[PDB]
Amino acid sequence: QNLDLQLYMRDCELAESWMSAREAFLNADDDANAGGNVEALIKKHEDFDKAINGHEQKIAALQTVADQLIAQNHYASNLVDEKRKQVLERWRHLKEGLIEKRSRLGD
Amino acid sequence: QNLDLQLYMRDCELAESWMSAREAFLNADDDANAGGNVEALIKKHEDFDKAINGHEQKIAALQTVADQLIAQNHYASNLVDEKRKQVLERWRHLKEGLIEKRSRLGD
């Protein structure tokens, strides 16, 4: 629900959608494709390399954002849990007094 | 983390403050021996049990909140991770096709 997480989800959805457009392109291509001319078999080749590259880059940036959001979540959970443990341990020492003093009332 | 986290830490702090006061009274009490007769010893003992139960109760409730916070963070991380997995798989499928249509146009 955090807006940051929301931006990331949006960004992931947008990346998927661009991928989907490319899947459709590959299909149309397969219905006709390029042409056995050297200059342009090569030009098409470079075009695929460019596509693949851009895709890979976009993927790596998203992974970077995912890593950040998860690291923030982990940090929050750790703080929460650790505070809990400190609180529980302080109770363990209170409790010890209570009970003992309760003994001392006379033994 | 944010708001929820802040309130919980404050709650824990307030709880710890309450336990510091108690443990303080205990210090006074630590000595605070004035003999005692049945009815009053008995009412002192009871008074202990009651504080012991109150404390235990606060703790339990703090625990519940900690668990909820942690569950919320786990959920969000899972959403994040899962989307990431998704993008990557969608990418793997597209890459497979780009490499295929490239190669014809290559060798």
PDB file of C-alpha atoms in Angstrom:
ATOM      1  CA  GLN A   1       0.000   0.000   0.000  1.00  0.00           C
ATOM      2  CA  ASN A   2       2.912   2.392   0.545  1.00  0.00           C
ATOM      3  CA  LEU A   3       2.927   4.757  -2.489  1.00  0.00           C
ATOM      4  CA  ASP A   4       6.509   3.731  -3.212  1.00  0.00           C
ATOM      5  CA  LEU A   5       5.541   0.163  -3.527  1.00  0.00           C
ATOM      6  CA  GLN A   6       2.703   1.397  -5.753  1.00  0.00           C
ATOM      7  CA  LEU A   7       5.063   3.229  -8.107  1.00  0.00           C
ATOM      8  CA  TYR A   8       7.156   0.071  -8.439  1.00  0.00           C
ATOM      9  CA  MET A   9       4.129  -2.077  -9.195  1.00  0.00           C
ATOM     10  CA  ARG A  10       3.056   0.435 -11.890  1.00  0.00           C
ATOM     11  CA  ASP A  11       6.569   0.427 -13.317  1.00  0.00           C
ATOM     12  CA  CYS A  12       6.538  -3.409 -13.394  1.00  0.00           C
ATOM     13  CA  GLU A  13       3.170  -3.402 -15.130  1.00  0.00           C
ATOM     14  CA  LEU A  14       4.437  -0.844 -17.726  1.00  0.00           C
ATOM     15  CA  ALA A  15       7.576  -3.039 -18.328  1.00  0.00           C
ATOM     16  CA  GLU A  16       5.383  -6.089 -18.817  1.00  0.00           C
ATOM     17  CA  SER A  17       3.165  -4.250 -21.261  1.00  0.00           C
ATOM     18  CA  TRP A  18       6.219  -3.061 -23.303  1.00  0.00           C
ATOM     19  CA  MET A  19       7.378  -6.713 -23.325  1.00  0.00           C
ATOM     20  CA  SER A  20       3.950  -7.752 -24.600  1.00  0.00           C
ATOM     21  CA  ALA A  21       4.110  -5.259 -27.431  1.00  0.00           C
ATOM     22  CA  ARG A  22       7.517  -6.782 -28.425  1.00  0.00           C
ATOM     23  CA  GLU A  23       5.992 -10.276 -28.323  1.00  0.00           C
ATOM     24  CA  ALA A  24       3.320  -9.094 -30.833  1.00  0.00           C
ATOM     25  CA  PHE A  25       6.078  -7.552 -33.049  1.00  0.00           C
ATOM     26  CA  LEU A  26       7.941 -10.805 -33.189  1.00  0.00           C
ATOM     27  CA  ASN A  27       4.807 -12.403 -34.433  1.00  0.00           C
ATOM     28  CA  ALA A  28       4.039  -9.978 -37.192  1.00  0.00           C
ATOM     29  CA  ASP A  29       7.690 -10.278 -38.194  1.00  0.00           C
ATOM     30  CA  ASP A  30       7.359 -14.030 -38.500  1.00  0.00           C
ATOM     31  CA  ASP A  31       4.460 -13.441 -40.894  1.00  0.00           C
ATOM     32  CA  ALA A  32       6.839 -11.543 -43.263  1.00  0.00           C
ATOM     33  CA  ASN A  33      10.172 -10.652 -41.612  1.00  0.00           C
ATOM     34  CA  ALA A  34      13.073  -8.893 -43.254  1.00  0.00           C
ATOM     35  CA  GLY A  35      14.891  -9.877 -46.485  1.00  0.00           C
ATOM     36  CA  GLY A  36      17.999 -11.925 -47.435  1.00  0.00           C
ATOM     37  CA  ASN A  37      19.932  -8.695 -48.375  1.00  0.00           C
ATOM     38  CA  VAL A  38      23.219  -8.338 -46.453  1.00  0.00           C
ATOM     39  CA  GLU A  39      22.959  -4.672 -45.529  1.00  0.00           C
ATOM     40  CA  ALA A  40      19.551  -5.122 -43.958  1.00  0.00           C
ATOM     41  CA  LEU A  41      19.911  -8.593 -42.462  1.00  0.00           C
ATOM     42  CA  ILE A  42      22.579  -6.886 -40.543  1.00  0.00           C
ATOM     43  CA  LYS A  43      20.490  -3.773 -39.855  1.00  0.00           C
ATOM     44  CA  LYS A  44      17.720  -5.997 -38.474  1.00  0.00           C
ATOM     45  CA  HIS A  45      20.257  -7.877 -36.418  1.00  0.00           C
ATOM     46  CA  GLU A  46      21.395  -4.661 -34.739  1.00  0.00           C
ATOM     47  CA  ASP A  47      17.780  -3.828 -34.079  1.00  0.00           C
ATOM     48  CA  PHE A  48      17.293  -7.088 -32.132  1.00  0.00           C
ATOM     49  CA  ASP A  49      20.511  -6.470 -30.172  1.00  0.00           C
ATOM     50  CA  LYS A  50      19.208  -2.982 -29.344  1.00  0.00           C
ATOM     51  CA  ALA A  51      15.826  -4.454 -28.240  1.00  0.00           C
ATOM     52  CA  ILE A  52      17.402  -7.139 -26.118  1.00  0.00           C
ATOM     53  CA  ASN A  53      19.718  -4.631 -24.554  1.00  0.00           C
ATOM     54  CA  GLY A  54      17.059  -2.101 -23.611  1.00  0.00           C
ATOM     55  CA  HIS A  55      14.927  -4.867 -22.167  1.00  0.00           C
ATOM     56  CA  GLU A  56      17.782  -6.173 -20.031  1.00  0.00           C
ATOM     57  CA  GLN A  57      18.529  -2.751 -18.712  1.00  0.00           C
ATOM     58  CA  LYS A  58      14.971  -1.967 -17.803  1.00  0.00           C
ATOM     59  CA  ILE A  59      14.778  -5.364 -16.040  1.00  0.00           C
ATOM     60  CA  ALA A  60      17.923  -4.569 -14.008  1.00  0.00           C
ATOM     61  CA  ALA A  61      16.628  -1.235 -12.895  1.00  0.00           C
ATOM     62  CA  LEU A  62      13.386  -2.780 -11.611  1.00  0.00           C
ATOM     63  CA  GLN A  63      15.354  -5.367  -9.734  1.00  0.00           C
ATOM     64  CA  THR A  64      17.145  -2.527  -8.125  1.00  0.00           C
ATOM     65  CA  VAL A  65      13.972  -0.984  -6.895  1.00  0.00           C
ATOM     66  CA  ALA A  66      12.633  -4.376  -5.661  1.00  0.00           C
ATOM     67  CA  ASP A  67      15.830  -4.835  -3.641  1.00  0.00           C
ATOM     68  CA  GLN A  68      15.326  -1.460  -2.014  1.00  0.00           C
ATOM     69  CA  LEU A  69      11.756  -1.954  -1.026  1.00  0.00           C
ATOM     70  CA  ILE A  70      12.473  -5.399   0.387  1.00  0.00           C
ATOM     71  CA  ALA A  71      15.548  -4.057   2.316  1.00  0.00           C
ATOM     72  CA  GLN A  72      13.285  -1.298   3.796  1.00  0.00           C
ATOM     73  CA  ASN A  73      10.708  -3.887   4.838  1.00  0.00           C
ATOM     74  CA  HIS A  74      13.414  -6.095   6.347  1.00  0.00           C
ATOM     75  CA  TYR A  75      14.827  -3.172   8.276  1.00  0.00           C
ATOM     76  CA  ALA A  76      11.414  -2.263   9.706  1.00  0.00           C
ATOM     77  CA  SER A  77      10.619  -5.866  10.701  1.00  0.00           C
ATOM     78  CA  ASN A  78      14.002  -6.253  12.333  1.00  0.00           C
ATOM     79  CA  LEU A  79      13.551  -3.070  14.394  1.00  0.00           C
ATOM     80  CA  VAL A  80      10.056  -4.185  15.443  1.00  0.00           C
ATOM     81  CA  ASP A  81      11.173  -7.651  16.482  1.00  0.00           C
ATOM     82  CA  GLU A  82      14.287  -6.524  18.219  1.00  0.00           C
ATOM     83  CA  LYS A  83      12.392  -3.870  20.246  1.00  0.00           C
ATOM     84  CA  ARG A  84       9.975  -6.676  21.195  1.00  0.00           C
ATOM     85  CA  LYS A  85      12.791  -8.861  22.426  1.00  0.00           C
ATOM     86  CA  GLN A  86      14.224  -5.977  24.539  1.00  0.00           C
ATOM     87  CA  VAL A  87      10.806  -5.269  26.041  1.00  0.00           C
ATOM     88  CA  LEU A  88      10.248  -9.007  26.811  1.00  0.00           C
ATOM     89  CA  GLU A  89      13.671  -9.213  28.468  1.00  0.00           C
ATOM     90  CA  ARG A  90      13.045  -6.157  30.610  1.00  0.00           C
ATOM     91  CA  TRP A  91       9.781  -7.830  31.672  1.00  0.00           C
ATOM     92  CA  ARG A  92      11.668 -10.914  32.545  1.00  0.00           C
ATOM     93  CA  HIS A  93      13.672  -8.898  35.055  1.00  0.00           C
ATOM     94  CA  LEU A  94      10.656  -6.994  36.416  1.00  0.00           C
ATOM     95  CA  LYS A  95       8.794 -10.260  36.857  1.00  0.00           C
ATOM     96  CA  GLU A  96      11.699 -11.684  38.707  1.00  0.00           C
ATOM     97  CA  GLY A  97      11.548  -8.996  41.298  1.00  0.00           C
ATOM     98  CA  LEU A  98       7.791  -9.077  41.664  1.00  0.00           C
ATOM     99  CA  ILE A  99       7.671 -12.828  42.397  1.00  0.00           C
ATOM    100  CA  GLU A 100      10.754 -12.894  44.611  1.00  0.00           C
ATOM    101  CA  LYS A 101       9.621  -9.883  46.708  1.00  0.00           C
ATOM    102  CA  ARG A 102       6.327 -11.763  46.849  1.00  0.00           C
ATOM    103  CA  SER A 103       8.314 -14.640  48.439  1.00  0.00           C
ATOM    104  CA  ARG A 104      10.193 -12.323  50.769  1.00  0.00           C
ATOM    105  CA  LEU A 105       6.900 -11.235  52.273  1.00  0.00           C
ATOM    106  CA  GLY A 106       7.872 -14.117  54.613  1.00  0.00           C
ATOM    107  CA  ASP A 107       9.358 -17.547  53.794  1.00  0.00           C
TER     108      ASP A 107
ATOM    109  CA  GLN B   1       8.729   1.762   8.518  1.00  0.00           C
ATOM    110  CA  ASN B   2       6.041   4.369   9.030  1.00  0.00           C
ATOM    111  CA  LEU B   3       3.062   5.416  11.255  1.00  0.00           C
ATOM    112  CA  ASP B   4       2.104   1.934  12.566  1.00  0.00           C
ATOM    113  CA  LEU B   5       5.687   1.407  13.375  1.00  0.00           C
ATOM    114  CA  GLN B   6       5.988   4.766  15.214  1.00  0.00           C
ATOM    115  CA  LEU B   7       2.876   4.113  17.403  1.00  0.00           C
ATOM    116  CA  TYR B   8       4.148   0.655  18.323  1.00  0.00           C
ATOM    117  CA  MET B   9       7.508   1.899  19.325  1.00  0.00           C
ATOM    118  CA  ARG B  10       5.864   4.585  21.393  1.00  0.00           C
ATOM    119  CA  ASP B  11       3.560   1.968  22.986  1.00  0.00           C
ATOM    120  CA  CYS B  12       6.599  -0.127  23.889  1.00  0.00           C
ATOM    121  CA  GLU B  13       8.292   2.943  25.315  1.00  0.00           C
ATOM    122  CA  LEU B  14       5.193   3.780  27.420  1.00  0.00           C
ATOM    123  CA  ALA B  15       5.091   0.189  28.591  1.00  0.00           C
ATOM    124  CA  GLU B  16       8.779   0.284  29.523  1.00  0.00           C
ATOM    125  CA  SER B  17       8.138   3.480  31.368  1.00  0.00           C
ATOM    126  CA  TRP B  18       5.383   1.797  33.373  1.00  0.00           C
ATOM    127  CA  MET B  19       7.741  -1.073  34.213  1.00  0.00           C
ATOM    128  CA  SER B  20      10.374   1.339  35.358  1.00  0.00           C
ATOM    129  CA  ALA B  21       8.021   2.923  37.772  1.00  0.00           C
ATOM    130  CA  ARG B  22       6.950  -0.455  39.145  1.00  0.00           C
ATOM    131  CA  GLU B  23      10.464  -1.787  39.451  1.00  0.00           C
ATOM    132  CA  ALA B  24      11.095   1.509  41.230  1.00  0.00           C
ATOM    133  CA  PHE B  25       8.313   0.983  43.790  1.00  0.00           C
ATOM    134  CA  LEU B  26       9.788  -2.418  44.149  1.00  0.00           C
ATOM    135  CA  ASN B  27      13.074  -0.757  45.189  1.00  0.00           C
ATOM    136  CA  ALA B  28      11.321   1.136  47.929  1.00  0.00           C
ATOM    137  CA  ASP B  29       9.471  -2.055  48.787  1.00  0.00           C
ATOM    138  CA  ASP B  30      12.821  -3.883  48.300  1.00  0.00           C
ATOM    139  CA  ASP B  31      13.230  -2.934  51.915  1.00  0.00           C
ATOM    140  CA  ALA B  32       9.757  -1.643  52.833  1.00  0.00           C
ATOM    141  CA  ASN B  33       9.338  -4.319  55.556  1.00  0.00           C
ATOM    142  CA  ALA B  34       6.930  -3.372  58.352  1.00  0.00           C
ATOM    143  CA  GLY B  35       6.239  -6.828  59.772  1.00  0.00           C
ATOM    144  CA  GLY B  36       2.609  -7.321  58.638  1.00  0.00           C
ATOM    145  CA  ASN B  37      -0.491  -9.171  59.878  1.00  0.00           C
ATOM    146  CA  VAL B  38      -2.471 -11.801  57.960  1.00  0.00           C
ATOM    147  CA  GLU B  39      -5.086  -9.689  56.218  1.00  0.00           C
ATOM    148  CA  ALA B  40      -2.467  -7.144  55.046  1.00  0.00           C
ATOM    149  CA  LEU B  41       0.169  -9.614  54.064  1.00  0.00           C
ATOM    150  CA  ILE B  42      -2.468 -11.328  52.061  1.00  0.00           C
ATOM    151  CA  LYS B  43      -3.568  -8.099  50.428  1.00  0.00           C
ATOM    152  CA  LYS B  44       0.052  -7.241  49.548  1.00  0.00           C
ATOM    153  CA  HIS B  45       0.591 -10.654  47.961  1.00  0.00           C
ATOM    154  CA  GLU B  46      -2.613 -10.171  45.957  1.00  0.00           C
ATOM    155  CA  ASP B  47      -1.460  -6.783  44.926  1.00  0.00           C
ATOM    156  CA  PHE B  48       1.595  -8.441  43.440  1.00  0.00           C
ATOM    157  CA  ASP B  49      -0.262 -11.015  41.552  1.00  0.00           C
ATOM    158  CA  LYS B  50      -2.392  -8.292  40.048  1.00  0.00           C
ATOM    159  CA  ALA B  51       0.558  -6.239  38.859  1.00  0.00           C
ATOM    160  CA  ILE B  52       2.129  -9.401  37.554  1.00  0.00           C
ATOM    161  CA  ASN B  53      -0.974 -10.111  35.564  1.00  0.00           C
ATOM    162  CA  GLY B  54      -1.298  -6.578  34.225  1.00  0.00           C
ATOM    163  CA  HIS B  55       2.223  -6.515  33.023  1.00  0.00           C
ATOM    164  CA  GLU B  56       1.887  -9.865  31.394  1.00  0.00           C
ATOM    165  CA  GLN B  57      -1.178  -8.607  29.670  1.00  0.00           C
ATOM    166  CA  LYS B  58       0.429  -5.432  28.319  1.00  0.00           C
ATOM    167  CA  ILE B  59       3.291  -7.583  26.984  1.00  0.00           C
ATOM    168  CA  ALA B  60       1.044  -9.980  25.250  1.00  0.00           C
ATOM    169  CA  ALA B  61      -0.725  -7.171  23.575  1.00  0.00           C
ATOM    170  CA  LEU B  62       2.551  -5.591  22.500  1.00  0.00           C
ATOM    171  CA  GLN B  63       3.500  -8.918  21.027  1.00  0.00           C
ATOM    172  CA  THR B  64       0.304  -9.048  18.990  1.00  0.00           C
ATOM    173  CA  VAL B  65       1.041  -5.689  17.472  1.00  0.00           C
ATOM    174  CA  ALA B  66       4.631  -6.716  16.688  1.00  0.00           C
ATOM    175  CA  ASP B  67       3.369  -9.834  14.925  1.00  0.00           C
ATOM    176  CA  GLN B  68       0.871  -7.757  12.878  1.00  0.00           C
ATOM    177  CA  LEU B  69       3.538  -5.321  11.838  1.00  0.00           C
ATOM    178  CA  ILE B  70       5.891  -8.049  10.843  1.00  0.00           C
ATOM    179  CA  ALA B  71       3.111  -9.861   8.929  1.00  0.00           C
ATOM    180  CA  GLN B  72       2.325  -6.662   7.011  1.00  0.00           C
ATOM    181  CA  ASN B  73       5.906  -6.108   6.094  1.00  0.00           C
ATOM    182  CA  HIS B  74       6.259  -9.788   5.012  1.00  0.00           C
ATOM    183  CA  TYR B  75       3.228  -9.502   2.857  1.00  0.00           C
ATOM    184  CA  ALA B  76       4.514  -6.331   1.114  1.00  0.00           C
ATOM    185  CA  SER B  77       7.944  -7.957   0.538  1.00  0.00           C
ATOM    186  CA  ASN B  78       6.255 -10.963  -0.937  1.00  0.00           C
ATOM    187  CA  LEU B  79       4.190  -8.777  -3.272  1.00  0.00           C
ATOM    188  CA  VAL B  80       7.364  -7.030  -4.322  1.00  0.00           C
ATOM    189  CA  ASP B  81       9.371 -10.255  -4.763  1.00  0.00           C
ATOM    190  CA  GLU B  82       6.597 -11.954  -6.612  1.00  0.00           C
ATOM    191  CA  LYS B  83       6.118  -9.118  -9.092  1.00  0.00           C
ATOM    192  CA  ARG B  84       9.893  -9.183  -9.700  1.00  0.00           C
ATOM    193  CA  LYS B  85       9.768 -12.941 -10.376  1.00  0.00           C
ATOM    194  CA  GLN B  86       6.935 -12.249 -12.779  1.00  0.00           C
ATOM    195  CA  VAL B  87       8.720  -9.561 -14.737  1.00  0.00           C
ATOM    196  CA  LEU B  88      11.747 -11.836 -14.963  1.00  0.00           C
ATOM    197  CA  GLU B  89       9.789 -14.749 -16.295  1.00  0.00           C
ATOM    198  CA  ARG B  90       7.938 -12.645 -18.823  1.00  0.00           C
ATOM    199  CA  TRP B  91      11.418 -11.328 -19.825  1.00  0.00           C
ATOM    200  CA  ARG B  92      12.831 -14.825 -20.172  1.00  0.00           C
ATOM    201  CA  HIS B  93      10.031 -15.798 -22.574  1.00  0.00           C
ATOM    202  CA  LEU B  94      10.486 -12.670 -24.744  1.00  0.00           C
ATOM    203  CA  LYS B  95      14.295 -13.000 -24.806  1.00  0.00           C
ATOM    204  CA  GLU B  96      13.891 -16.636 -26.009  1.00  0.00           C
ATOM    205  CA  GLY B  97      11.904 -15.335 -28.978  1.00  0.00           C
ATOM    206  CA  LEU B  98      14.212 -12.405 -29.754  1.00  0.00           C
ATOM    207  CA  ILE B  99      17.189 -14.670 -29.821  1.00  0.00           C
ATOM    208  CA  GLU B 100      15.313 -17.019 -32.187  1.00  0.00           C
ATOM    209  CA  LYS B 101      14.206 -14.456 -34.676  1.00  0.00           C
ATOM    210  CA  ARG B 102      17.600 -12.834 -34.385  1.00  0.00           C
ATOM    211  CA  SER B 103      19.633 -16.006 -35.395  1.00  0.00           C
ATOM    212  CA  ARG B 104      17.733 -16.655 -38.601  1.00  0.00           C
ATOM    213  CA  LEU B 105      18.803 -13.155 -39.357  1.00  0.00           C
ATOM    214  CA  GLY B 106      22.323 -14.109 -38.614  1.00  0.00           C
ATOM    215  CA  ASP B 107      23.420 -17.626 -39.540  1.00  0.00           C
TER     216      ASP B 107
END
